[PDB]
Amino acid sequence: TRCKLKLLRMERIKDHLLLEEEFVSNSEILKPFEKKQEEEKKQLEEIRGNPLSIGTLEEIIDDDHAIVTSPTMPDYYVSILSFVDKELLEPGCSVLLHHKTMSIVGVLQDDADPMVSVMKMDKSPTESYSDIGGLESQIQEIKESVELPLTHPELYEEMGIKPPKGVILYGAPGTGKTLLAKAVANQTSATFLRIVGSELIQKYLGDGPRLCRQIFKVAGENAPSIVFIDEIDAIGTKRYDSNSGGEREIQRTMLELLNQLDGFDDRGDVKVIMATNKIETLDPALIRPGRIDRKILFENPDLSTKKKILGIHTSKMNLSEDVNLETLVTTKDDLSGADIQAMCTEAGLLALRERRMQVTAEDFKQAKERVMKNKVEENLEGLYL
Amino acid sequence: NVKDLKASQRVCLRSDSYMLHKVLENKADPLVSLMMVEKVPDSTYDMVGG
Amino acid sequence: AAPYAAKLKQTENDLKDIEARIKEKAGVKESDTGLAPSHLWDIMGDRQRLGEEHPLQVARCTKIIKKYVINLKQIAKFVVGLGERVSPTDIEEGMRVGVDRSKYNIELPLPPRIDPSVTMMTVEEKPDVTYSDVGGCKDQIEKLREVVELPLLSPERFATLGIDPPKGILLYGPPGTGKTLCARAVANRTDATFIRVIGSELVQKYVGEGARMVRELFEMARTKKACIIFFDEIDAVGGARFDDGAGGDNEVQRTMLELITQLDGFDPRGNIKVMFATNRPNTLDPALLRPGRIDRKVEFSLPDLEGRANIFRIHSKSMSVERGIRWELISRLCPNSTGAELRSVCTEAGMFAIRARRKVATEKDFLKAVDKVISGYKKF
Amino acid sequence: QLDGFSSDDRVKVLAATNRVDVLDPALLRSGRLDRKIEFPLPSEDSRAQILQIHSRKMTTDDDINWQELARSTDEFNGAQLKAVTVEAGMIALRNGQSSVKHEDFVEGISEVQARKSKSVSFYA
Ligand SMILES: Nc1ncnc2c1ncn2[C@@H]1O[C@H](COP(=O)(O)OP(=O)(O)OP(=O)(O)O)[C@@H](O)[C@H]1O
Ligand SMILES: [Mg+2]
Numbered sequence: 008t009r010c011k012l013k014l015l016r017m018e019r020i021k022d023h024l025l026l027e028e029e030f031v032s033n034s035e036i037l038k039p040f041e042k043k044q045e046e047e048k049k050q051l052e053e054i055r056g057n058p059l060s061i062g063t064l065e066e067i068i069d070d071d072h073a074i075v076t077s078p079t080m081p082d083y084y085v086s087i088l089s090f091v092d093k094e095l096l097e098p099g100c101s102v103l104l105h106h107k108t109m110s111i112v113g114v115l116q117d118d119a120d121p122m123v124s125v126m127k128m129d130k131s132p133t134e135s136y137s138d139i140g141g142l143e144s145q146i147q148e149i150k151e152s153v154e155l156p157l158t159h160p161e162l163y164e165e166m167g168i169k170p171p172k173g174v175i176l177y178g179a180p181g182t183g184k185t186l187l188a189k190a191v192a193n194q195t196s197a198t199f200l201r202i203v204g205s206e207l208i209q210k211y212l213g214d215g216p217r218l219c220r221q222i223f224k225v226a227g228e229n230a231p232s233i234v235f236i237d238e239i240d241a242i243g244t245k246r247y248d249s250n251s252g253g254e255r256e257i258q259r260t261m262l263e264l265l266n267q268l269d270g271f272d273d274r275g276d277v278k279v280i281m282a283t284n285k286i287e288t289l290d291p292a293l294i295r296p297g298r299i300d301r302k303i304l305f306e307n308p309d310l311s312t313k314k315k316i317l318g319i320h321t322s323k324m325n326l327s328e329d330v331n332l333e334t335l336v337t338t339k340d341d342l343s344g345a346d347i348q349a350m351c352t353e354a355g356l357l358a359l360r361e362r363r364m365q366v367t368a369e370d371f372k373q374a375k376e377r378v379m380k381n382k383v384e385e386n387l388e389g390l391y392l
Numbered sequence: 393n394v395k396d397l398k399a400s401q402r403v404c405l406r407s408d409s410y411m412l413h414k415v416l417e418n419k420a421d422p423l424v425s426l427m428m429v430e431k432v433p434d435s436t437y438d439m440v441g442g
Numbered sequence: 443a444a445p446y447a448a449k450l451k452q453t454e455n456d457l458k459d460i461e462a463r464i465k466e467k468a469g470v471k472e473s474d475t476g477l478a479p480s481h482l483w484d485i486m487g488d489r490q491r492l493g494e495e496h497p498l499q500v501a502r503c504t505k506i507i508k509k510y511v512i513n514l515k516q517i518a519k520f521v522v523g524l525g526e527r528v529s530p531t532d533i534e535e536g537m538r539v540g541v542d543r544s545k546y547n548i549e550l551p552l553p554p555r556i557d558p559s560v561t562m563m564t565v566e567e568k569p570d571v572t573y574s575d576v577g578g579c580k581d582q583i584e585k586l587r588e589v590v591e592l593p594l595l596s597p598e599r600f601a602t603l604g605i606d607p608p609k610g611i612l613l614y615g616p617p618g619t620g621k622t623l624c625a626r627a628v629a630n631r632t633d634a635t636f637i638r639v640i641g642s643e644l645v646q647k648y649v650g651e652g653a654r655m656v657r658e659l660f661e662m663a664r665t666k667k668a669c670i671i672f673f674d675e676i677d678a679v680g681g682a683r684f685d686d687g688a689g690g691d692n693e694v695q696r697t698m699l700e701l702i703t704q705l706d707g708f709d710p711r712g713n714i715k716v717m718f719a720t721n722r723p724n725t726l727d728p729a730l731l732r733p734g735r736i737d738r739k740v741e742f743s744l745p746d747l748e749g750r751a752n753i754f755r756i757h758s759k760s761m762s763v764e765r766g767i768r769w770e771l772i773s774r775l776c777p778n779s780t781g782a783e784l785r786s787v788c789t790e791a792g793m794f795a796i797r798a799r800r801k802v803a804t805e806k807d808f809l810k811a812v813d814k815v816i817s818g819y820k821k822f
Numbered sequence: 823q824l825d826g827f828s829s830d831d832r833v834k835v836l837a838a839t840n841r842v843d844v845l846d847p848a849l850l851r852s853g854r855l856d857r858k859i860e861f862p863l864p865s866e867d868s869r870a871q872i873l874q875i876h877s878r879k880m881t882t883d884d885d886i887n888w889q890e891l892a893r894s895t896d897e898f899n900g901a902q903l904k905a906v907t908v909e910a911g912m913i914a915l916r917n918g919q920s921s922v923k924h925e926d927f928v929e930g931i932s933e934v935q936a937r938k939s940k941s942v943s944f945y946a
């Protein structure tokens with residue numbers, strides 16, 4: 008509350024100050040155009056008529072010629088002319104070629120594709136750590152694999168043990184698995200890549216395997232990293248059937264990722280967060296520990312856990328201090344943390360029908376009936392016989 | 393200019409030059425295509441009401 | 443309450459404007475690679491740009507008729523001739539050619555095909571691993587020495603017995619058996635070249651493009667002497683047929699077929715060993731499994747108790763351990779399983795000790811790590 | 823085009839396929855391939871001869887009893903059989919004797935089998 012206000016005051020004088028500084032600083036009159044810049048500039052316009060049709064450098068022959076494939080089915084045996092060093096260019100690089108005559112005018116690309124930008128989602132994690140009402144014990148298993156080598160390399164180095172490779176998150180939805188994922192992400196401040204596995208299920212020829220390779224390249228470039236392959240099972244054990252053109256694709260994608268997860272050796276610097284509902288009643292495709300190490304089963308919320316979650320929610324409510332908190336959680340059997348979240352939302356909705364702006368003392372005892380009854384129907388547990 | 397441009401914005405181009413013309417907000421998406429078949433959803437609550 | 447609501451509302455606008463101001467910062471300054479003295483290069487470069495000898499359109503001789511019949515890659519055929527002077531003996535079926543944009547004459551013969559260059563990126567040279575620190579005392583480790591080393595080191599004995607030299611080994615085992623690990627170790631020790639092919643990567647298809655790559659790579663090998671060609675994960679693509687499906691597919695039968703025929707019948711080889719990595723022999727087409735392709739098959743056998751104490755020790759050395767720690771006792775409690783399972787147990791024992799705030803892992807830690815892994819596998 | 827009586831005699835055609843049930847249906851109509859040859863399983867006689875072909879390459883060992891080997895094997899085609907031969911000699915290469923013994927061979931069948939060679943057993 009107050010802690011948040013203190014911060015607002017500082018954030019609004021930082022932005023203001025920066026913005027004003029920036030005019031001058033960027034230039035607006037500074038206008039570097041002295042001999043070093045002028046050189047670059049003059050040359051660049053002359054040489055480069057535009058548009059410039061990109062290539063891929065297939066091989067070099069030492070005689071300042073290269074062999075490139077252009078987007079046209081005819082390839083072109085080109086001169087290297089001007090700019091980019093011969094050494095700096097290594098085969099497999101994507102390159103700028105001049106449209107009048109194809110010559111290597113430089114590189115600025117590095118095999119830039121839109122696919123990498125899409126995946127790249129470092130962007131502000133919605134979760135900070137321990138905003139969540141989850142239990143200390145569950146998060147301090149994910150943290151142990153992922154955080155702990157980055158914060159304290161001293162202990163791992165001294166022991167001599169390798170840093171762990173991967174974790175698997177599985178529950179039980181409504182244990183806030185993806186909340187957990189973005190709690191971890193905030194702390195590390197690592198490049199947080201995300202890709203969903205259904206984008207790798209397509210009828211399109213061979214595209215799945217191409218995508219799989221991209222992922223390892225991306226993580227390594229932007230290391231240290233966490234790669235969230237979310238619904239890993241979409242590619243794997245989970246299905247899209249084979250009487251739909253799937254007798255080609257699904258096999259090739261599953262194998263491909265599998266082969267790169269082992270690799271010639273575990274990378275040991277790319278953390279993974281693998282999501283899947285549970286691989287207990289599903290087939291396992293996440294191929295043995297040492298490449299996925301510690302595997303994390305989140306408990307179904309017990310009575311003490313939901314107390315902590317419940318405390319967040321009751322703060323905004325007024326007239327729930329007279330209501331005894333303890334008795335609402337007990338009376339309900341042990342159930343999802345999602346069901347306490349559902350209850351809070353329903354509770355407010357319900358107060359409005361009574362016509363009271365925020366919950367009445369009565370409204371809260373009533374709220375429990377509607378949510379418990381709905382949820383037990385949705386999910387029925389074996390009846391004791 | 394490069395300032396105005398935004399990543400992933402669809403653009404018009406003149407001839408084989410490929411000089412910028414206008415930016416297009418305009419995007420082909422299936423949801424939009426489904427809406428056009430669908431049109432303005434009719435109708436009053438009361439008629440449904442019972 | 444209310445006068446402090448409006449403090450939030452102000453905050454939000456600011457943060458958004460700063461982010462757009464990044465574009466303005468980057469500015470308009472353009473500068474390209476070629477520092478120190480490669481911008482003085484550019485001055486030479488200018489006059490030669492206006493000059494003409496580049497590009498050359500690339501085409502490929504498809505027949506030499508004593509002029510030449512060239513076929514371009516857009517698919518269009520021409521009769522052409524020699525340019526400055528191009529010897530007849532240089533131009534051969536499959537040989538690329540450099541021809542002029544529109545005056546259509548050969549300047550330089552160019553080495554055949556652009557497809558080796560693409561696939562030579564995948565190829566990795568003689569990997570190195572030390573055979574001594576290869577876990578287990580496996581029987582499998584020994585039969586690899588017979589296949590690979592002994593024909594290369596002493597081809598004489600094989601001639602004398604009047605057996606054929608062993609050249610094919612099929613590796614299969616559960617994941618974590620160490621198929622990749624042992625192949626790298628015998629590549630190193632025997633001092634023979636190595637060719638990495640990954641069959642899972644084949645996707646370039648036009649009905650039989652995958653078949654072109656495979657013929658070229660295997661042929662690359664023959665040219666090479668004392669070499670290994672390791673086709674990795676041929677479980678699918680050049681592995682299983684997808685004919686079985688309702689609509690089905692046969693781009694995989696093309697790739698599969700080509701490989702079978704290169705192996706089957708006469709065809710020279712320059713001491714080419716054939717290593718095949720399949721997770722399961724079941725997935726592998728039976729055509730390949732049954733003999734006259736790969737000579738030998740070994741079913742990997744999970745490490746012995748002596749071999750399992752042995753892998754654990756390798757790990758325990760890397761670790762900081764208790765003095766008098768009973769490696770053998772830990773191992774016995776542990777299932778008969780891969781070298782992998784054992785790698786994991788040492789990993790978690792390390793971590794629980796760190797959590798508990800110890801720098802030396804106790805015997806007790808590894809009792810905990812074991813209990814963890816058994817349960818995992820079981821529950822699934 | 824080969825049909826007739828002049829075109830059949832010059833131009834001859836052989837064809838090889840494994841599965842015969844996946845073919846084009848216009849091929850099972852008429853006499854497109856004028857003769858169809860099914861391979862039978864090998865006999866005792868067939869096995870014993872193929873072994874001899876392989877064994878000649880190797881040093882002649884009259885301790886080899888072609889008959890005894892052939893009796894225990896059932897349904898090993900030509901390629902399978904050569905696998906056996908190479909294995910008996912491989913034991914002998916380790917041994918150092920240029921000689922291959924009949925004993926090496928009886929053991930050498932069981933690697934080419936699904937089972938690993940001389941699988942451990944509780945009684946013996
Ligand atoms: N002999 C061994 N000693 C120690 N650890 C071993 C041994 N063999 C394999 N491992 C361990 O198992 C894991 C994978 O080994 P490796 O990469 O060779 O697997 P593989 O059987 O070839 O699998 P894939 O099916 O993924 O291709 C590693 O964690 C490695 O340390
Ligand atoms: Mg979720």
Ligand SMILES: [Mg+2]
Pocket residue numbers: 269621622719
């Ligand atoms: Mg492997």
